[PDB]
Short mmCIF file of C-alpha atoms in Angstrom, two decimals:
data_model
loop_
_atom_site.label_atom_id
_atom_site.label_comp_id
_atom_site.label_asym_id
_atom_site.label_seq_id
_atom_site.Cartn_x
_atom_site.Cartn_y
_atom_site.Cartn_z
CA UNK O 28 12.50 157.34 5.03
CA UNK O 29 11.44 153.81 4.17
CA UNK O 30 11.46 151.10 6.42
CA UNK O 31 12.79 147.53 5.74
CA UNK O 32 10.98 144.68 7.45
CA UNK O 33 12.47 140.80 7.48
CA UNK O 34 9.43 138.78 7.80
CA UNK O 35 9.38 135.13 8.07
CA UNK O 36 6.66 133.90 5.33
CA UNK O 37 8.05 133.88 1.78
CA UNK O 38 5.20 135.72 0.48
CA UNK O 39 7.74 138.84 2.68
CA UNK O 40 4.39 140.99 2.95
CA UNK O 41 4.62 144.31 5.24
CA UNK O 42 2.60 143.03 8.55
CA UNK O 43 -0.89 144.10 7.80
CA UNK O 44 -0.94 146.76 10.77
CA UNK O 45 1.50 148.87 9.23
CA UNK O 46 -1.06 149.96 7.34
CA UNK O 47 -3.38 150.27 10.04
CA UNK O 48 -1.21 152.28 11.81
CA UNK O 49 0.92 154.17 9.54
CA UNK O 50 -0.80 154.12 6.30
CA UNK O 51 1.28 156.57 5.16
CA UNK O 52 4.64 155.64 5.55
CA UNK O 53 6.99 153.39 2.83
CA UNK O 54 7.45 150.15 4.32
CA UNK O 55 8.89 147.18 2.27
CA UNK O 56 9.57 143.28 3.60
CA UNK O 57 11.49 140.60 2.33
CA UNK O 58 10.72 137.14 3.63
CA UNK O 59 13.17 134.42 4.75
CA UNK O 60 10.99 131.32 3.89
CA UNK O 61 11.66 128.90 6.90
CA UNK O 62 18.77 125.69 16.81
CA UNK O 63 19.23 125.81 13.25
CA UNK O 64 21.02 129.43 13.89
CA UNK O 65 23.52 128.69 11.20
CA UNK O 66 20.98 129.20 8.33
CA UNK O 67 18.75 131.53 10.62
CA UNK O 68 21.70 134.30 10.77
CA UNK O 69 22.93 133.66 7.25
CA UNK O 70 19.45 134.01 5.58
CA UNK O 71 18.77 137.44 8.35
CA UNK O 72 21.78 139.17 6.88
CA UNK O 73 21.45 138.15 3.38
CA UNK O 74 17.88 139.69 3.64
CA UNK O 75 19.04 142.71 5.36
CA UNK O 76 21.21 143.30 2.29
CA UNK O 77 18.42 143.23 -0.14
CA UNK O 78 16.38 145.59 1.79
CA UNK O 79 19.06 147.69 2.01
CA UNK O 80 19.82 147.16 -2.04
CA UNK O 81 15.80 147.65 -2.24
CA UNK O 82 16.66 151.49 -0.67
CA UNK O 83 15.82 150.83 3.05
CA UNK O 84 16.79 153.24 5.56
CA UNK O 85 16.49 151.04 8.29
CA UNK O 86 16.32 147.44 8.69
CA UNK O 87 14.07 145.34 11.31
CA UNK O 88 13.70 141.65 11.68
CA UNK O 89 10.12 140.97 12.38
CA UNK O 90 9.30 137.49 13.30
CA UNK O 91 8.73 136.02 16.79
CA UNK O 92 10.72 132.84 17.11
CA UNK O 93 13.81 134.36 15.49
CA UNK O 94 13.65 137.74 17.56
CA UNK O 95 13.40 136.11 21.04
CA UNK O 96 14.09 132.38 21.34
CA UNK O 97 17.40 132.09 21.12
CA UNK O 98 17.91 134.56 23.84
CA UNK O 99 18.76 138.08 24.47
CA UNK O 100 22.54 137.90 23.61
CA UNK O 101 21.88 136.53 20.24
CA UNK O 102 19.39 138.99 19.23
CA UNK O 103 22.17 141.76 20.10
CA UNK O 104 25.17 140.01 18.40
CA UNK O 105 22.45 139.11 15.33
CA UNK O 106 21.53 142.93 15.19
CA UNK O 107 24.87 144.16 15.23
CA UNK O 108 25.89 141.68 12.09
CA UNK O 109 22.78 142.97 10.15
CA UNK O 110 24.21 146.65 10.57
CA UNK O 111 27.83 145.27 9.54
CA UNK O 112 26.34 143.90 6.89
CA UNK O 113 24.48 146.54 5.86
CA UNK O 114 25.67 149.73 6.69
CA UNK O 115 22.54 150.97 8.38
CA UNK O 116 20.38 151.07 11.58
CA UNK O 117 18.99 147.82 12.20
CA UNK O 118 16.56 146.52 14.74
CA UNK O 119 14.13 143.50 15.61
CA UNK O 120 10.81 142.83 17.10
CA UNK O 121 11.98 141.57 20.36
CA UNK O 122 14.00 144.89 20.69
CA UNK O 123 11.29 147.09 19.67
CA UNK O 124 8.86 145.27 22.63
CA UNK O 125 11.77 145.75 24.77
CA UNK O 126 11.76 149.34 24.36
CA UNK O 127 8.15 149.60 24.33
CA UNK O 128 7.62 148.10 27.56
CA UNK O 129 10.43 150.30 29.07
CA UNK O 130 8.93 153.15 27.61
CA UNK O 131 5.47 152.90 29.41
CA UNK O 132 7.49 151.69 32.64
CA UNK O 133 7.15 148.39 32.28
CA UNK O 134 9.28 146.36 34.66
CA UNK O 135 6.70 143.46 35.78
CA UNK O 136 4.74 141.94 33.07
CA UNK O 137 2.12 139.35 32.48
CA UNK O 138 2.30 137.19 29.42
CA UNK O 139 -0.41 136.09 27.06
CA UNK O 140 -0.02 134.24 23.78
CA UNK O 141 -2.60 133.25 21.71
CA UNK O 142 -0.53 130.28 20.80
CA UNK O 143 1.16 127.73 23.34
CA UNK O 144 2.62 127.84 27.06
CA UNK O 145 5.91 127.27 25.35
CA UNK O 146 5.62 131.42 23.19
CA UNK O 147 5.21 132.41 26.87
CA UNK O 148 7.99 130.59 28.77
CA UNK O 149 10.40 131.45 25.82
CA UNK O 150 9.42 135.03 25.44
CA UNK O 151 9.52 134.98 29.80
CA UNK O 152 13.26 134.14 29.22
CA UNK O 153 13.90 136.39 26.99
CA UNK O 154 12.71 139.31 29.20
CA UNK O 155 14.55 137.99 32.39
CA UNK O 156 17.99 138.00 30.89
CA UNK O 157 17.25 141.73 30.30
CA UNK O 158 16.35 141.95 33.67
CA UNK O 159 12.17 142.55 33.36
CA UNK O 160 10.35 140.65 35.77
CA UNK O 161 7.84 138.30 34.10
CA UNK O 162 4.69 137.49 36.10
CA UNK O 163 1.71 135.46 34.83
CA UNK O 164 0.89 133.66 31.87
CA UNK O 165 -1.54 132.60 29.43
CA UNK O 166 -2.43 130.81 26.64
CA UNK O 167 -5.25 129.91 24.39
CA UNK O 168 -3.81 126.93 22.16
CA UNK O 169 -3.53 125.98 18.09
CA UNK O 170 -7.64 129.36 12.12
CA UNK O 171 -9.25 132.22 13.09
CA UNK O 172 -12.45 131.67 14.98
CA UNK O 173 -10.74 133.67 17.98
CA UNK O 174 -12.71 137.35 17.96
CA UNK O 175 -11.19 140.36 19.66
CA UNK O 176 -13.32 138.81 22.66
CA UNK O 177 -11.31 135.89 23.59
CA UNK O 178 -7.70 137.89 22.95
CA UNK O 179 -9.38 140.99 25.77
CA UNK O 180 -10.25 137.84 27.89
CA UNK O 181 -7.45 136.17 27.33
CA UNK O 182 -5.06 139.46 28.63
CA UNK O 183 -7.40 139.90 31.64
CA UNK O 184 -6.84 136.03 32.83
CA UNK O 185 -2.97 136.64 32.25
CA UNK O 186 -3.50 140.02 34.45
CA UNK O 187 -5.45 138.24 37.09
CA UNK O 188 -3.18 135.30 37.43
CA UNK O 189 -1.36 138.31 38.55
CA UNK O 190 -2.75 141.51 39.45
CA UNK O 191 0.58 143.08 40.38
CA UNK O 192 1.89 143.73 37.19
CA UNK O 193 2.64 146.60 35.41
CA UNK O 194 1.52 146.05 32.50
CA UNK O 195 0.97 143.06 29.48
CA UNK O 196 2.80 141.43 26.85
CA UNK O 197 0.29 140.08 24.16
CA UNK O 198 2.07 137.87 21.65
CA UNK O 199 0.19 135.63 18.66
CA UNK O 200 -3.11 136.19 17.91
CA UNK O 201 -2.70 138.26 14.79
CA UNK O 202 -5.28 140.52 12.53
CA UNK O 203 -7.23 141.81 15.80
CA UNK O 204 -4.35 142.17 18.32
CA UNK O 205 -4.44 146.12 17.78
CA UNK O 206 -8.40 145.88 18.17
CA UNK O 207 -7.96 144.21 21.40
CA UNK O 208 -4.91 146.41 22.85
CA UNK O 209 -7.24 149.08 23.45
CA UNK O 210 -9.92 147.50 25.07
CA UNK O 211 -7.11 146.17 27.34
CA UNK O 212 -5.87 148.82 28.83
CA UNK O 213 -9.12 150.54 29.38
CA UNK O 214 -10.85 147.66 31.46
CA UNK O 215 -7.56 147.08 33.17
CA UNK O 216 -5.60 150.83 33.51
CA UNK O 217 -2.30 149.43 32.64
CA UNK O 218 -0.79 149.04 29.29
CA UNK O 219 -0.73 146.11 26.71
CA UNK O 220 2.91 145.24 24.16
CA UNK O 221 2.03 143.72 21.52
CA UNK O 222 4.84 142.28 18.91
CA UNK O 223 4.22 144.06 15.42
CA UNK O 224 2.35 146.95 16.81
CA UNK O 225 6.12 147.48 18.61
CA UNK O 226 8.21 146.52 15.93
CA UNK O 227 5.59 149.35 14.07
CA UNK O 228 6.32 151.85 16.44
CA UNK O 229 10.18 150.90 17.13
CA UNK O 230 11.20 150.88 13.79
CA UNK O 231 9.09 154.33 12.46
CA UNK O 232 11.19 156.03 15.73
CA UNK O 233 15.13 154.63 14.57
CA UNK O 234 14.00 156.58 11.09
CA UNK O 235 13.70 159.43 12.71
CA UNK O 236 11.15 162.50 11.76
CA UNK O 237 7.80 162.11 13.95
CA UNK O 238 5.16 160.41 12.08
CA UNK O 239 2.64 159.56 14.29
CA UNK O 240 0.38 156.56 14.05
CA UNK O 241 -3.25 156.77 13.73
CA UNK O 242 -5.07 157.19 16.83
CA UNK O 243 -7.02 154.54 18.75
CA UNK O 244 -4.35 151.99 18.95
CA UNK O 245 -2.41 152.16 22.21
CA UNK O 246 -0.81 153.37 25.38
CA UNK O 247 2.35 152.79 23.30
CA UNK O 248 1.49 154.99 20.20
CA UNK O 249 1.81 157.75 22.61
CA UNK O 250 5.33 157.41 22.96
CA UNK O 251 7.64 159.69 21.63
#
């Protein structure tokens, strides 16, 4: 069944690990272009509509800021006026990391961003309203001279700000986040969320049958 994506670049390319992961599944995107909720939910469900026009199955919103910063209550109200709108299953990214880090029993959980302090402390919020714990953080700070290297080191220093945790929540960083993941969880034992790797996996299980992803890619791609 093919998979909708709302992605926030115009260009509305499917992520590139979709086809890292699941290169043989029918994904399409549609992108929005770019608390200015008012035009945030009207463009989301106007979106959802063409993917569902476009012959999605099911619908998820992909895109960091608009999954998680304007809290947990707003993504669920947001999610449940893209189904309204649409008549189908719908889902985001922050959902889909959610349900990931539930899935590999993920209650505390270290944050690390490529990106700024602020990804963290929002995305930290985001997870405390739904009653995760969130533990330490990490950033780098903003190209692409950062090498799967410096996103594994990067983890490990949000990890050792806090060895307690159960696990981590990588966000930013981009092309080699699913390169990194792996390396991760094997120098550390405990797993590693990333945001479109989830949103991947979360929105492949709401279509139901059992594709499987590739292998190589993840604590989480074991999953059912």
């Amino acid at each position: 069944p093919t998979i909708g994506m709302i992605v926030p670049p115009a260009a509305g390319l499917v992520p590139a690990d979709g086809a890292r992961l699941y290169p043989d599944l029918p994904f399409i995107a549609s992108g929005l272009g770019l608390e200015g909720y008012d035009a945030v939910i009207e463009s989301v469900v106007d979106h959802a509509r063409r993917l569902q026009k476009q012959g999605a199955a099911v619908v998820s919103l992909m895109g960091t800021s608009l999954s998680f910063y304007r809290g947990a209550a707003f993504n669920a109200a947001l999610t449940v006026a893209m189904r309204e709108a649409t008549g189908l299953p719908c889902t985001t990214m922050s959902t889909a990391v959610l349900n990931g880090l539930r899935a590999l029993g993920v209650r505390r959980v270290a944050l690390a961003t490529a990106y700024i302090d602020d990804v963290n402390e929002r995305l930290a919020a985001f997870l405390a309203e739904e009653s995760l714990v969130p533990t330490g953080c990490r950033s780098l700070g903003i190209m692409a001279r950062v090498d799967t290297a410096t996103l594994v080191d990067l983890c490990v220093r949000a990890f050792e700000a806090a060895p307690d945790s159960d696990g981590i929540l990588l966000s930013c960083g981009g092309l080699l986040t699913l390169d990194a993941i792996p390396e991760v969880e094997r120098r550390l034992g405990v797993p590693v969320v990333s945001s479109s790797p989830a949103g991947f996996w979360d929105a492949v299980r709401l279509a139901g049958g059992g594709a499987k992803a590739r292998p190589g890619y993840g604590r989480l791609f074991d999953e059912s």
